[PDB]
Amino acid sequence: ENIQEKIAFIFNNLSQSNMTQKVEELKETVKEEFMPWVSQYLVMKRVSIEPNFHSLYSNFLDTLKNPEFNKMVLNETYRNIKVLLTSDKAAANFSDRSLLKNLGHWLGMITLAKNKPILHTDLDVKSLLLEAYVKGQQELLYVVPFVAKVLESSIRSVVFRPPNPWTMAIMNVLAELHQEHDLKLNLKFEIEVLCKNLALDINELKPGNLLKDKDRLKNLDEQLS
Amino acid sequence: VENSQVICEVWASNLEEEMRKIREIVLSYSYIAMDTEFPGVVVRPIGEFRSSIDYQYQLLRCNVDLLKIIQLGLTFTNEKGEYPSGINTWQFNFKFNLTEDMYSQDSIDLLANSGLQFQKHEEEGIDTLHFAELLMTSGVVLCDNVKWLSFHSGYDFGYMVKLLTDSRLPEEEHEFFHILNLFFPSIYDVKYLMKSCKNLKGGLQEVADQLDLQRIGRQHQAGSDSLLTGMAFFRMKELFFEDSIDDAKYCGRLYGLG
Amino acid sequence: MKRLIICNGNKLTVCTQAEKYTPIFSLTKESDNELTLELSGVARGYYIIPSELTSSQARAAHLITLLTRAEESQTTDMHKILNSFVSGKITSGSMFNFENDGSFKREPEEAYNLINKI
Ligand SMILES: [Mg+2]
């Protein structure tokens, strides 16, 4: 338990200036066995409630240079997103909504901005959006801002820049949701903000008819609840 | 030959069904042999194109930016050389209209002789954008354990860089190989390994006789040539290189471009 | 007799053998989207654009048809390159060779060597 406080102390006063020295302190203090605890602590107690200090943690991951630890962090993030998504969607869970938004931002920062993909066996985004549309109005509030946050970091990826087929695949679905007359002004303005951030034109996109395929929407894989 | 239980044709109908068995097959069987069928070379470059490597790159670029893919064959193997218990080659067939597309009649004619169905390609064919969208979130591309294998893959890796980025290829080779390294990190090229070998020279079929390998399928196709590429590499590495492919010299390079 | 098309950025020049090549007509793409015709070599006359037909896309298509001796209800293999250039799929200095009938040059050795990976 004494070590448990040292990890918190190390993460508390992190700065760009002392990043290397604090990394050395952490490598000296924490063991190999206790690394999963640090991964869960960083993704559950530090990243997900503090959206302002995110570049610091990405730089910490880069400086540490531990692919096993990076995989542990990514897996814990995916598990947390799944737990939040497949939960009782209470209409007043603003804390949960912010939690999901911040975790999605972190996911987009540590996968898309690192020129790595979001694996389908771990999380599918287009199917998530279609299921959100088919389930009702509550799940859209959870999904559309989360997907916008994930795609926000695509502009910093030379692989996942707008002309990427996958990014346009997600963006055309979001454009359809934008065109939907039953969607709310909040979600519509969020989609427009994402389009501005990616420097696209909502009028220049190529929306399809994915929301009109009842047969496809019936047999969707269930990542929600 | 056997092109039924070892080679699976992927149309636009069974694309998501046969892409589900690729994600679950790439996890344990990582090496992917690659072949691409395309309508040939049709446009020549002009200018102050010295640096025969640079000339080769521009000859690649001028043709890739205008011609459209017609077939892509992938074969899955593990380190030792075993195959994934049944279907191990996928032959993706794309869209191609023989009346409103770009082609050279000396390539289309012999491909039609080989057996490609240009009436079926027009109706049931995979759209490149959809294929790329399914490819990015599959783990086949952009991963680190996947080690691609190919034979004289100048145009093979350019057509899919265009397909996977939906943009024209970069002007110089510096920005082409940089993005190729991000997409496919390991580019073991059998021909580059060949131009270090004692006697092995020629083409694919002219070396499949020297290596004593039997071709499974029909010639000049995509799926039945990726299998021969894979078997050729797993014989060359075993026999000449003493079970080692040195990363520094023979990896990440192509024939002509490197 | 052979024909050639040179795409030097904004200029699409069509030329005929006479391997010296004499240009017949050149299309210039203006600032935004305008297309201009510069029939040359004979420098005017001879090949005559018919009445009515005035648009640059149509004059160039008719001239290519008259050069290739092709049928009216035909989109020949030079017409396809013209259309690709106008639509903007040829944005670089490039060279396209053709026979008299309009298809790309027959290159059996290159095709056979490029399909056998030689
Ligand atoms: Mg081939």
Author numbering:
A (entry chain B): 1093 to 1317
B (entry chain C): 6 to 263
C (entry chain A): 1 to 18, 26 to 125
Task: Quote from the publication.
We determined the cryo-EM structure of the NOT1:NOT8:PieF ternary complex at 3.5 Å resolution to further elucidate paralog-specific differences in PieF-mediated deadenylase inhibition. The resulting model includes the same NOT1 and PieF residues as in the NOT7 complex, while NOT8 is nearly complete, missing only the first five and last 29 residues (V6–G263 out of 292). NOT8 associates with NOT1 in a manner nearly identical to NOT7 closely matching previously determined structures, suggesting that PieF does not prevent the incorporation of the inhibited deadenylase into the CCR4-NOT complex. The structures of the NOT7 and NOT8 are nearly identical, with a few notable differences. NOT8 residues do not contact S99PieF and G100PieF. At the same time, T98PieF interacts with the R173NOT8 (N173NOT7), which additionally interacts with the carbonyl group of K96PieF, a contact absent in the NOT7 structure. Although highly similar, NOT7 and NOT8 exhibit their main structural and sequence divergence beyond residue 265—a region likely flexible and unresolved in either cryo-EM structure. In the same experimental setup, NOT8 (which has ~3-fold lower basal activity than NOT7) was inhibited ~6-fold by PieF. The measured dissociation constant (Kd) values for NOT7 and NOT8 were ~24 nM, indicating high-affinity binding.
